[PDB]
């Protein structure tokens, strides 16, 4: 049907935008500077970022671990108001990471993306409210884009105050700021200036005192005020465009809100506005008009790099400016070149930073294509400008019914962040103001003509109208059918009739988002469960060859396609040379590359063998250590058109998404294993290499001038022999491609250890061996434990090797090690319907109940389903699958199989089965009696049972966080600094923390020594620790503990704070009072 516009452009667009202009306009707005005395102009033709060009392949920049960027010149102009003379130059000022294929950026060689967030929009708003009785004040409030605010209200007088921040101010003269005659807001309001008139105290004191003491006796107190004062005060605060952006929006709303008339770019405000407000406030004291609800998606706005950036740049400037302001100005009239008077830096920071950190330069994560998408078109509420988790609570997390269509409600982390992080509906997108125009369909006489290329309007939910939910039994040829078609309307649903209706949704699955509108039979499940679903889907590792599932929602080919994890017919051509690393159908020069000569790009390699030499890349690490690669996939000599797709990303398959596989499942209660939240598995499962994935691995290490010296990298190290000085290069590195194991050496380096501190007993033991011992710690690098796996690579980094290292390091070495992994007991692994499950036993294949045809089934989940999960949806499709599994044919589908009085999905599926018999007559393919139930024997001995069990194929999926990702142990190890208690943090020998509630399970029990000791000897009596340890090594018990540390610490503090702690004993018959350490 429709056309899915590109679904990430969201941020393609933005950037381009900016780029295309989004900063010129700022820029040259900031172009005009000039001496401190108007006498020496410093303006520039800010209308060209004249940017020379990126230096690196992307690839490079990865390899160089550098920030793909650009850099960027501004021609400037003829300077000075003393003798008007140019000393013209241009300048670049900074490097700009000019985006990437995935519409994101990479920097420092890593890979990141900038989320886009969502905030309220400048303009004005009113909130009224009650007392404890019903005194129903109002308020008002203003927000620039940037700059302070202006607050108003009505405090049981009906008489009012121009508060500025929260309640900073409060003046009866709410509208007597910079206006004489008074009538301008006494009669020009033609309403109720202070309910018709005047405050009580409508005193009109504002002659020479105008803009004086108002901004002093109850502002900003404590100075001999000065009518200037007050003035130069306000006018700052609202007039230097310097600091008050309304925001195009700003206007744009206003006016709209108040059909003010001020178009005018009037990027900052007026008076007439102000009052205009105030009226409105009044008018509704009298109640003529509406308070405003910010929750309404419409009056709330989302913004992306384009400006996030941009403005952040602006501040870059200002800072810069100053520097210049003087450095340019104050000094003499010659030296001042349009060159050494400007410096990047501050910009280069600001951005270098912005990216380099915000909360928005998030890392990408490329687990798998759709984890991207959905992480680009994610949008967020938090962030600087936003909220915090705390400072915003709840009803600000809910489905304001305007989200409809615009924010998949199904979609959310949790943790606290529920609600704070939504993603984007499928079809949504945004208007240059940064509200989400929502595609729809114009139904005439309550009937969509379809022809309409949708209806890209309804940026806000208040189209206000008959709007139909894109799930309508629709008469062929337009007409709706039921005279009871619902509709939202003014945020309400409402029984409607087909005639008097306007708007239909383009589809019944738009409000949802990625991983949500994809559920095979969504329509049929709990929501939340489907929540989980989605997410799981994002976490499915990718596999050697993730197969396109069987029953899928149609909607995906695209999704893949726009990952940009695949490789797409750029243009056009009929393949020729395609080895497994590129498709020289490209730089070769024949029909591929040459209808890559049909029509022949602007600058690009317009005909020849073109750098349509796409490479294609094997096994690169991911933000999750997962590997990716795109085998040629296409044949040779054949015919492709742009947008087609050439080779496949990690886990996509026919050029379409493919997240996991599909295997035959049964539902029964296998004793113990599977008993509950447990899954069985045949052995063939991973025996066929299905479900095994890759993972690979960064390992770097580096050497560094101790002020003892260097420390190095030798082949040689003391104390070696096999797994040491064996699988080791001349610099003690490894050869590419070397098995390794769990303790062997990655790279060996030593250290200038020397001595200068030793126990006589060590000197002894020399003497006896009189070994003149060596002197060099030897921090080789060893594979830790529980790793395997070939080595892919190394990446040395020293003066010559890029020298990318901390100040004073010599070599840095990366090393990369990969790893197949089969499945194995212990792996979250779940379906597309919140089917969180863990492997428990694997059965050798010849024990599972197989099938009537003996085909051994192979998972076996628990039958009783759709409980709290309410995900009955998944049987539906199992079944289905199985149909297209026996029929051996994939089938797309869509949630909400409506236009059918009955379940529809229900008589499909049967139908298919049904007929599936007879195309093979296998018969047991389908049993109307006990639908899709089957007999089953069971391998172990050879019988079915009283109750036939359903059977289906089904698409499962295996999940990143893998057992090894969470395993730990610690006999003992490194402690803390200050507080010596073992160093528990996850990577490295950590330790289980026993918080109060945990101790509340110990002292709550009976004999609690343990408690005690646990509190100490395995965490603190320092000496206690040791010598226990010992004491067991001895072979006996352990000695009595002492007092833990952290006590002693507490002493200290407290003592360090005006105390006289006398912990102390009271001994002797003379009872003796002492004190202690």
């Amino acid at each position: 049907a429709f056309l899915l516009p590109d679904l990430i452009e969201i941020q393609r667009s933005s950037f381009r935008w900016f780029l295309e202009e989004g900063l010129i306009e700022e820029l040259n707005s900031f172009s005009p500077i000039t001496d401190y005395t108007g006498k020496l102009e410093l303006h520039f033709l800010g209308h060209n970022y004249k940017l020379k060009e990126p230096k690196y392949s992307v690839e490079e920049a990865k390899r160089r671990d550098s920030t793909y960027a650009v850099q960027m010149y501004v021609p400037t102009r003829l300077l000075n108001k003393e003798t008007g003379d140019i000393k013209e130059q241009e300048v670049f000022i900074g490097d700009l990471p000019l985006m990437t294929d995935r519409g994101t950026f990479i920097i420092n060689g890593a890979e990141r993306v900038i989320v886009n967030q969502i905030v309220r929009s400048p303009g004005v708003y009113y909130k009224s409210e009650i007392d404890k009785n019903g005194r129903r004040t109002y308020s008002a409030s203003l927000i620039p884009n940037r700059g302070a605010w202006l607050k108003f209200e009505t405090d049981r007088n009906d008489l009012v105050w121009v508060r500025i921040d929260k309640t900073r101010k409060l003046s009866a003269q709410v509208l007597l700021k910079a206006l004489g005659l008074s009538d301008n807001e006494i009669f020009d309001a033609l309403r109720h200036p202070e309910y018709f008139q005047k405050t009580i105290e409508k005193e009109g004191q504002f002659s020479e005192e105008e803009a004086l003491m108002e901004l002093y006796r109850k502002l900003r107190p404590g100075e001999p005020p000065t009518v200037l004062g007050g003035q130069q005060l306000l006018d700052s605060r609202f007039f230097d465009p310097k600091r008050y952006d309304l925001g195009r929006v700003g206007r744009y709303k206003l006016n709209k809100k108040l059909r003010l008339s001020v178009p005018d770019t009037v990027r900052v405000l007026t008076s007439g506005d102000i009052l205009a407000a105030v009226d409105y406030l009044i008018n509704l004291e009298y109640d003529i008009g509406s308070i405003d609800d910010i929750d309404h998606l419409g009056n709330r706005r989302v913004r992306s790099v384009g400006e996030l950036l941009q403005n952040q740049v602006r501040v870059g400037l200002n800072r810069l400016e100053r520097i210049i302001r003087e450095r340019m100005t104050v000094s003499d009239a010659e030296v001042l070149t349009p060159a050494s008077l400007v410096n990047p830096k501050p910009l280069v920071a600001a951005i270098k930073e912005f990216f380099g950190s915000s909360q928005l330069s998030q890392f990408m994560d490329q687990t798998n294509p759709l984890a991207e998408l959905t992480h680009k078109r994610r949008l967020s509420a938090l962030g600087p400008g936003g909220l915090t988790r705390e400072r915003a609570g709840f009803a600000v997390r809910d489905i304001h019914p305007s989200h409809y269509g615009r924010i998949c409600p199904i979609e959310t982390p949790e943790g606290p962040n529920a609600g704070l992080i939504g993603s984007l509906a499928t079809h949504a997108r945004v208007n240059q103001y940064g509200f989400l125009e929502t595609p729809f369909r114009p139904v005439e006489n309550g009937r969509v003509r379809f022809d309409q290329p949708a209806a890209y309007m309804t940026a806000d939910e208040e189209d206000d109208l008959r709007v139909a939910p894109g799930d309508i039994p629709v008469d062929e040829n337009g007409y709706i059918i039921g005279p009871q078609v619902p509709v939202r309307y003014r945020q309400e649903f409402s029984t409607t009739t087909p005639e008097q209706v306007d708007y239909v949704a383009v589809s019944p699955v738009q409000i949802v988002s990625v991983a949500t509108s994809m559920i095979p039979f969504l329509e049929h499940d709990d929501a939340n469960r489907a929540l989980m679903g989605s997410n799981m889907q994002r976490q499915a590792v990718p596999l050697l060859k993730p197969e396109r599932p069987l029953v899928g929602t149609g909607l995906e080919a695209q999704g893949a396609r726009d990952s940009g994890m695949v490789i797409v017919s750029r243009t056009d051509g009929d393949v020729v040379y395609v080895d497994a690393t590129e498709i020289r159908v490209r730089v070769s020069g024949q029909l591929p590359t040459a209808s890559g000569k049909s029509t022949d790009n602007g600058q690009l390699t317009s005909q020849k063998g073109q750098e349509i030499r796409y490479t294609v890349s094997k096994y690169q690490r991911s933000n999750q250590d997962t590997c990716l690669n795109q085998k040629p996939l296409v044949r040779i000599g054949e015919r492709v058109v742009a947008g087609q797709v050439l080779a496949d990303g990690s886990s996509t398959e026919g050029g379409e998404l493919a997240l996991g596989q599909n295997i035959v499942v049964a539902y029964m209660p296998w004793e113990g294993y599977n008993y509950e939240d447990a899954i069985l598995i045949s052995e063939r499962l991973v025996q066929d290499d299905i479900y095994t994935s890759i993972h690979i691995e960064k390992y770097e290490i580096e050497a560094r001038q101790t002020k003892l010296g260097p420390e190095e990298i030798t082949r040689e190290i003391p104390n070696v022999g096999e797994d040491a000085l064996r699988q080791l290069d001349e610099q003690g590195i490894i050869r590419i491609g070397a098995w390794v194991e769990a303790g062997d050496i990655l790279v060996g380096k030593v250290t200038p250890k020397g001595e200068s501190d030793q126990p006589p007993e060590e000197k002894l033991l020399r003497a006896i061996f009189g070994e003149k011992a060596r002197d060099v710690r030897d921090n080789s690098l060893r594979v830790p434990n529980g790793e395997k796996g070939r080595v892919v690579d190394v990446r040395l980094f020293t003066r010559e090797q890029g020298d990318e290292l901390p100040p004073g390091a010599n070599m840095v070495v990366r090393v990369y090690v990969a790893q197949k992994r089969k499945i194995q007991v212990g792996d979250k692994m779940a379906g597309r319907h919140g089917n969180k499950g863990i492997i428990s036993r694997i059965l050798p294949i010849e024990d599972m109940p197989y099938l009537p045809d003996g085909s051994p089934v192979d998972i076996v989940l628990n039958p009783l389903g759709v409980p709290s999960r309410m995900n009955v949806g998944q049987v539906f499709e199992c079944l289905l699958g199985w149909a297209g599994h026996t029929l051996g044919v994939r089938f797309k589908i869509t949630p909400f199989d409506e236009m059918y009085g009955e379940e529809s999905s229900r008589r499909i599926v049967h139908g298919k089965l049904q007929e599936a018999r007879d195309e093979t007559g296998k018969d047991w393919v389908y049993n109307p009696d006990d639908p899709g139930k089957i007999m089953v024997y069971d391998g172990r001995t050879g019988e079915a049972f009283d109750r036939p069990v359903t059977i289906g194929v089904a698409y499962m999926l295996k999940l990143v966080h893998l057992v090894d990702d969470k395993i730990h142990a610690r006999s003992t190890g490194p402690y803390s600094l200050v507080t010596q208690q073992p160093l528990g943090g996850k990577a490295q020998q950590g330790g289980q923390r026993f918080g109060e509630m945990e101790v509340w399970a110990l002292e709550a029990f009976g004999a609690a020594y343990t408690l005690q000791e646990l509190l100490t000897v395995k965490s603190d009596d320092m000496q206690g620790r040791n010598e226990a340890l010992n004491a067991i090594v001895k072979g006996k018990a352990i000695p009595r503990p002492g007092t833990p540390e952290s006590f002693k610490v507490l002493m200290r503090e407290l003592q360090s704070l005006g105390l006289d702690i006398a912990v102390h004993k009271v001994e002797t018959q003379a009872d003796g009072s002492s004190l202690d350490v």
Binding site: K39, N80, E82, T83, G84, D85
Partner: protein
């Protein structure tokens, strides 16, 4: 907001409902049928005397009038035009055919009233050389508020000067 008269029923009537701007001076009154867009409200709004009508451009938005008395079509002819951005920016010097030169106190196309600034004349005459005393004899202009700036310089053949040098500086009695 009260209850009904003891409460019973409340209504509509059909009889269609017009949504009638302040700028909807209507022509149609109770109990008149006119037709579907019969003629109906027409707004003969009004202004008054003032100056020119400089046709509020009919156009200048969608419609967007701007309905003026324009009035002071001041013929300052021979305001001749020597005007540029040298290491300044623009100045219809308004040299005039008499080479008077009325520089741009108001510059072009601003809008200011009440003793508004207008035009600035040059003269090197009655200007003094390098400072000095003006032991003049006999012009007339008042204290006037503005024996200062704001001058109705009445009458003078009469203004004699002692243009002087002037070098006035705190420091010790230390040097020359």
């Amino acid at each position: 907001t009260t209850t009904a008269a003891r409460g019973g029923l409340i209504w509509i009537l059909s009889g269609e409902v017009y949504n009638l701007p302040p700028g909807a001076e209507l022509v149609v009154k109770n109990g008149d049928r006119v037709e579907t867009n019969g003629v109906l409200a027409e707004t003969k709004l009004t202004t008054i005397h003032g100056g020119v009508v400089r046709l509020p451009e009919a156009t200048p938005g969608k419609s967007t009038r701007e309905i003026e008395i324009i009035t002071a079509s001041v013929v300052l002819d021979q305001a001749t035009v020597t005007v540029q951005s040298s290491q300044g920016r623009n100045n219809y010097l308004i040299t005039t055919g008499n080479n008077q030169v009325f520089n741009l106190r108001a510059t072009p196309g601003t809008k200011v009233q009440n003793g508004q600034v207008v035009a600035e004349l040059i003269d090197d005459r009655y200007r003094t050389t390098t400072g000095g005393f003006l032991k003049f004899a006999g012009v007339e202009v008042q204290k006037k508020g503005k024996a200062k700036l704001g001058y109705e310089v009445v009458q003078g053949g009469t203004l004699l000067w002692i243009p002087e040098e002037t070098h006035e500086v705190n420091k010790d009695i230390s040097l020359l």
